[PDB]
Design an enzyme around this catalytic site. Structure first.
Site, short mmCIF file in Angstrom:
data_model
loop_
_atom_site.label_atom_id
_atom_site.label_comp_id
_atom_site.label_asym_id
_atom_site.label_seq_id
_atom_site.Cartn_x
_atom_site.Cartn_y
_atom_site.Cartn_z
N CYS A 1 5.32 2.38 9.43
CA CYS A 1 5.33 1.10 8.59
C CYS A 1 6.28 1.05 7.73
CB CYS A 1 3.95 0.96 8.05
SG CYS A 1 3.08 2.06 6.87
N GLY B 1 4.12 6.99 9.69
CA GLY B 1 5.43 6.59 9.01
C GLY B 1 6.09 5.54 9.46
N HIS C 1 0.94 -1.17 -0.07
CA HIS C 1 -0.08 -0.01 0.20
C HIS C 1 0.85 1.35 -0.10
CE1 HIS C 1 0.80 0.98 4.35
NE2 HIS C 1 0.17 -0.23 4.62
C1 LIG Z 1 2.44 3.14 8.32
O1 LIG Z 1 2.88 4.35 8.35
C2 LIG Z 1 0.89 3.44 9.13
C3 LIG Z 1 1.14 3.54 10.53
C4 LIG Z 1 -0.08 3.61 11.72
C5 LIG Z 1 -0.47 5.10 11.52
C6 LIG Z 1 -1.20 5.60 12.80
C7 LIG Z 1 -0.62 5.10 14.27
N1 LIG Z 1 0.14 3.97 13.95
C8 LIG Z 1 0.35 3.34 12.99
O2 LIG Z 1 0.98 2.05 12.99
N2 LIG Z 1 -0.30 2.67 8.53
C9 LIG Z 1 -1.19 3.04 8.01
O3 LIG Z 1 -0.98 4.14 7.36
C10 LIG Z 1 -2.46 2.46 7.66
C11 LIG Z 1 -2.91 2.36 6.27
C12 LIG Z 1 -3.15 0.79 5.62
C13 LIG Z 1 -4.51 1.07 4.74
C14 LIG Z 1 -4.74 -0.07 3.77
C15 LIG Z 1 -4.20 -1.11 4.21
C16 LIG Z 1 -4.29 -1.26 5.76
C17 LIG Z 1 -3.40 -0.12 6.36
N3 LIG Z 1 -3.49 2.90 8.53
C18 LIG Z 1 -3.84 2.23 9.75
O4 LIG Z 1 -2.96 1.70 10.53
C19 LIG Z 1 -5.14 2.83 10.28
N4 LIG Z 1 -5.72 1.28 10.69
C20 LIG Z 1 -6.72 0.85 10.09
O5 LIG Z 1 -6.97 0.93 8.83
O6 LIG Z 1 -7.62 0.29 10.82
C21 LIG Z 1 -8.50 -0.93 10.45
C22 LIG Z 1 -10.08 -0.31 10.78
C23 LIG Z 1 -10.62 0.81 9.79
C24 LIG Z 1 -12.05 1.19 10.15
C25 LIG Z 1 -12.60 0.62 10.91
C26 LIG Z 1 -12.18 -0.39 11.72
C27 LIG Z 1 -10.62 -0.89 11.31
C28 LIG Z 1 -5.24 3.89 11.46
C29 LIG Z 1 -4.11 4.72 11.23
O7 LIG Z 1 -6.48 4.33 11.52
C30 LIG Z 1 -7.08 3.81 13.04
C31 LIG Z 1 -8.66 3.69 12.35
C32 LIG Z 1 -6.54 2.50 13.39
C33 LIG Z 1 -6.90 5.05 13.63
#
Ligand SMILES: *[C@@H](O)[C@H](C[C@@H]1CCCNC1=O)NC(=O)[C@H](CC1CCCCC1)NC(=O)[C@@H](NC(=O)OCc1ccccc1)[C@@H](C)OC(C)(C)C
Ligand SMILES: *[C@@H](O)[C@H](C[C@@H]1CCCNC1=O)NC(=O)[C@H](CC1CCCCC1)NC(=O)[C@@H](NC(=O)OCc1ccccc1)[C@@H](C)OC(C)(C)C
Lengths: 306, 306
Positions: free
Chosen positions: B145, B143, B41
């Site tokens: 990830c 950042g 992603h």
């Molecule tokens: C890597 O840079 C990054 C790290 C995140 C950033 C916030 C704090 N901690 C972290 O580890 N990861 C991302 O940017 C994720 C994006 C991807 C999107 C497509 C594939 C999946 C991950 N973002 C997240 O980690 C989000 N989590 C998430 O998507 O949760 C699943 C979900 C969504 C909606 C309803 C229920 C469950 C975070 C940042 O968003 C939340 C909702 C957890 C705050």
């Protein structure tokens, strides 16, 4: 999200650890430019730890008594000298991996990281603080003395601790890199103890602010108290007095969170005075004191190095 | 003496972290020989995280869309490919600092260390375990990830985890280095939760043995119980069943300490069934479960690496 005891990356310091052998003794040393540092009771044998005169034992030794190995390569000493409780061996090669570095002497309540070593080889890395009784609750075994403690700041390596000995209670005592002990301890094998310790009050509030940043919140109230009315209750639970200067350092924390500094004090006041009733702050069931205000902001807000 | 949450020296892995940018996205990648690894992603923009077809979005991109910087030096991609949820960018230079290394996929209850990163620059290192619900309670911000998890074994670096996302409760989800997720999670921004967790019973006993090695001892009794009579009470406090194989792995611990394995079980039986009455094991007020039997022996007995 999340909050862990975190340690600085140890790569820059692994490039320095070497092994030092003399007589029947072997310990770790630190190699920077053309000098290797190590504790002086490496010229001690087992007979020389009652009440030794190190100055007079060092006039006995010659340069070839000190075996220095960096990797499977032997370093050749060419000179040697004494500075307080540390010993400096000048060798003919300069360490190519010597980083930007810098000796500093820290103040109780400050934290640093420790890379434990055996036979010049790193074993593991963890986070400590200097207690108010000037000792440290480390994890150390035989051969560990010579390991250092250090902080990283952008890209400079501030070396602040060399390890020397364990105490009857199991805490630990060593020196700064200029050879001076933290605490009233000496390097001769006689009777010594640590003295009564206190809890680091400013660090406790910083961890409590970290909690609110992460979600936890069952501990804030609507009361306040005064700075003197705080110390009155801190006095009794063996905490340290909190000073006007400590208050300022908590400015940006109180800021970003919205909870006034004296408000969080009145919250901690109840926690001491009622216990926790079986609920946990940041996974913990005790009031944790090995997090400075610096540590909280660098972890909750994203700061790295290079 | 002393017992700390310890992490492997992070030097060998810092030599690999780089920065990867594509479009408006920037994250960490891992550089080994002539290949850089990162989550897929990173070809996603903000519109591509509802329910994307990655295969069809990857046919759109060209090699020069991927900016790879190692230090203040630009790496030139020449090819690219997809393996499950990870993405592999072939570059024209081989990493001279590539260590002896090796991809492995771990089992819940095992522990590893994490070097958190931002913009290709290490920030800090800590110790985790894979929970029984296949998540991890890390410390991660934006950042992060691309950071990896890893164990060191003599001198080989077994890479076991790449970080992807945080979950609504604040725990974390990622993959092994061959791109397969730990747990039933997917990489699209829809609804997901972790599922009910349990405590890692074998690790709890290993920490209790560490305690006796260090002095603590107010918890041993004279009772015993049977392996089935243990699981009956473990069942109720939401612990995991303990198996005949787990018992064996605790052989050298029971050995060196003198306390039979089933004897320590009957001790833990009371602790669950009476609480702690305000006294602490190894500084802790909770029953701690992120120490394997391996971790105890390497720390209490002196094992390093090279
Ligand atoms: C890597 O840079 C990054 C790290 C995140 C950033 C916030 C704090 N901690 C972290 O580890 N990861 C991302 O940017 C994720 C994006 C991807 C999107 C497509 C594939 C999946 C991950 N973002 C997240 O980690 C989000 N989590 C998430 O998507 O949760 C699943 C979900 C969504 C909606 C309803 C229920 C469950 C975070 C940042 O968003 C939340 C909702 C957890 C705050
Ligand atoms: C460095 O390799 C080594 C590490 C020690 C080894 C045991 C576990 N942990 C450690 O950190 N340090 C030493 O070898 C010390 C020897 C020096 C002798 C001259 C200068 C002082 C230290 N040994 C110790 O750390 C001993 N501590 C000690 O001397 O305590 C003071 C004392 C003595 C008698 C009565 C009261 C107080 C340890 C190993 O011995 C004890 C008594 C702590 C078990």
């Amino acid at each position: 999200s999340g909050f862990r005891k975190m340690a600085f990356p140890s790569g820059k310091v692994e490039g320095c650890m070497v092994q030092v052998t003399c007589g029947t003794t072997t310990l770790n040393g630190l190699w920077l430019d053309d000098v290797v540092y190590c504790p002086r009771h490496v010229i001690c044998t087992s007979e020389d730890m009652l009440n030794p005169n190190y100055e007079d034992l060092l006039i006995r030794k010659s340069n070839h008594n000190f075996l220095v190995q960096a990797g499977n390569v032997q370093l050749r000493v060419i000179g040697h000298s004494m500075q307080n409780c540390v010993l400096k061996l000048k060798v003919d090669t300069a360490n190519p991996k010597t980083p930007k570095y810098k000796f500093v002497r820290i103040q109780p309540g400050q934290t640093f990281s420790v890379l434990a070593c055996y036979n010049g080889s790193p074993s593991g890395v963890y986070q400590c603080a200097m207690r108010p009784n000037f000792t440290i609750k480390g994890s150390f075994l035989n051969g560990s003395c010579g390991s250092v403690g250090f902080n990283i700041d952008y890209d400079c390596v501030s070396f602040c601790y060399m390890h020397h000995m364990e105490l009857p209670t199991g805490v630990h005592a060593g020196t700064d890199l200029e050879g001076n002990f933290y605490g009233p301890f000496v390097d001769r094998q006689t009777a010594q103890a640590a003295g009564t310790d206190t809890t680091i009050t400013v660090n406790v509030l910083a961890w409590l602010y970290a909690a609110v940043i992460n979600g936890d919140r069952w501990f804030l109230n609507r009361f306040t108290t005064t700075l003197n009315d705080f110390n009155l209750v801190a006095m009794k639970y063996n905490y340290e007095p909190l000073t006007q200067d400590h208050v300022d350092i908590l400015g940006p924390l109180s800021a970003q969170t919205g909870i006034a500094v004296l408000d969080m004090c009145a919250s901690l006041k109840e926690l001491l005075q009622n216990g926790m009733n079986g609920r946990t702050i940041l996974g913990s069931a005790l009031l944790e004191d090995e997090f400075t205000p610096f540590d909280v902001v660098r972890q909750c807000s994203g700061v790295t190095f290079q």
